[PDB]
């Protein structure tokens with residue numbers, strides 16, 4: 517399986533994880549000596565090793581999770597490490613569960629959670645897709661990066677109506693175009709230490725790109741962390757409008773680019789935190805009263821299965837659940853939770 521030199525670095529990595537008595541990553545938690553020993557010499561048919569899985573968590577001890585899938589096969593071959601980490605991270609996605617098939621449900625039925633625009637500055641729904649036939653970042657060749665870019669660029673550039681827009685490859689992009697995209701918060705940068713140590717950024721910026729529509733309500737990142745990160749956003753709180761746009765776009769893309777998908781895990785993504793629906797429906801929202809006590813905000817959000825992140829008392833608040841529920845259900849959890857959070861804010 518894995519080359520002797522790889523196994524050697526794996527042994528050193530296991531020791532580092534043991535050295536880090538302070539470490540709280542799911543990687544440390546589930547990479548017992550037993551599981552390590554059984555997996556350390558294995559290799560997928562494409563050549564991915566346990567090192568290609570855990571290197572990021574070894575290098576960055578402060579990782580929360582600390583593993584990534586280098587190809588789809590890795591989810592199966594290294595299941596003894598992936599499965600419990602997935603179970604632990606995706607709370608409530610049980611051993612006996614399977615992630616449901618795609619179901620966007622009635623996309624137009626979602627409401628404006630803040631019609632007055634008093635709390636929510638903007639609403640965004642994102643998903644991620646891997647492209648069928650291509651492995652994840654660390655197993656991609658330069659040629660695959662470029663071929664993927666060509667296919668995606670051609671597909672996106674043929675979108676019409678609301679979705680009509682412009683594709684910009686990162687390669688050779690001028691500073692002026694960079695500033696324009698930065699000003700709209702459309703540009704992504706080369707991946708951070710977690711992605712670097714996962715070998716997720718090889719050949720950067722080759723095959724990396726950004727697309728947005730004329731209206732600036734639709735944004736796609738190509739080969740940032742996943743092959744496709746697909747995002748619908750607009751000012752205010754109309755989650756119905758946002759989700760409808762996203763689903764329309766994802767459906768249109770799928771006609772030309774089939775996606776990698778798994779019977780149990782749902783849509784396959786590079787990081788296992790993004791599996792299942794992959795959906796992250798969020799508001800950027802100002803809740804000055806509830807934010808007087810950050811710990812209280814966190815507690816209340818969690819009660820309604822919401823996650824609080826950065827994004828001046830302005831929070832990115834999103835659905836916490838990704839696996840074991842439909843896309844419709846995930847957006848609905850965000851919808852209902854935000855409605856309830858706003859009520860709490862008003863009444864405090």
Ligand SMILES: NC(=[NH2+])NCCC[C@H](N)C(=O)O
Pocket residue numbers: 572578579580581582583710741787789790
């Ligand atoms: N962008 C992400 N996939 N974030 C979640 C994982 C981040 C990093 N690998 C960690 O374990 O903390």
